[PDB]
């Protein structure tokens, strides 16, 4: 499970839990997930992206580990 956290931790060079939506998508595709771009955007549209600018990856990690 920690592999998912570490994957984002590589991008997060401070360990805060907030990254960009662009980098987020890059990590998801880096993990080799079996989800399509459409599905990524589906979840993205149900999250905060074009609002504050910093997307919390923790929410995605938990969601992924639940499904």
């Amino acid at each position: 499970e920690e592999e998912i956290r570490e994957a984002f931790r590589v991008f997060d060079k401070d360990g805060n839990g907030y990254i960009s939506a662009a980098e987020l998508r890059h990590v998801m595709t880096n993990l080799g997930e079996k989800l399509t771009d459409e599905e990524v955007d589906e979840m993205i549209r149900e999250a905060d992206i074009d609002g504050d600018g910093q997307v919390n990856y923790e929410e995605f990690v938990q969601m992924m580990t639940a499904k």
Partner: protein, 119 residues
């Protein structure tokens, strides 16, 4: 190098560094020891905050207070750093600065401040 959270804010702040003098942000530590870096950033978003040209590097004692207080007064920024602490240490931690700018950035974007360039 796009693979790095700190890289995003680095280029972001560095972009404004080209519009200033006596200030050079090489890293989120030594380059912030001048104090002016904080005021420069705040002044860029809030021109009516204070006069950057009237600020002296020797006024560091008031510089930090001016930056923090004004940012918290006009943008309710989270005071994660202190004037005494920063002056006493001289060199702040990159994580502390990152987190400070992090929430600040978010607060500015959610208030439609950073989104000053559409396409």
């Amino acid at each position: 190098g796009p693979l790095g959270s700190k890289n995003m804010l680095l280029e972001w702040c560095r972009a404004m560094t080209r519009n200033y003098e006596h200030v050079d942000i090489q890293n989120f530590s030594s380059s912030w020891s001048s104090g002016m870096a904080f005021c420069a950033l705040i002044h860029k978003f809030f021109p009516e905050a204070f006069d950057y040209a009237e600020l002296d590097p020797a006024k560091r004692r008031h510089n930090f207070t001016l930056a923090f207080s004004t940012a918290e007064k006009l943008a309710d920024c989270a005071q994660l750093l202190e004037v005494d602490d920063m002056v006493r240490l001289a060199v702040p931690d990159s994580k502390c600065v990152y987190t400070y700018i992090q929430e600040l950035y978010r607060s500015l974007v959610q208030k439609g401040l950073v989104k000053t360039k559409k396409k």
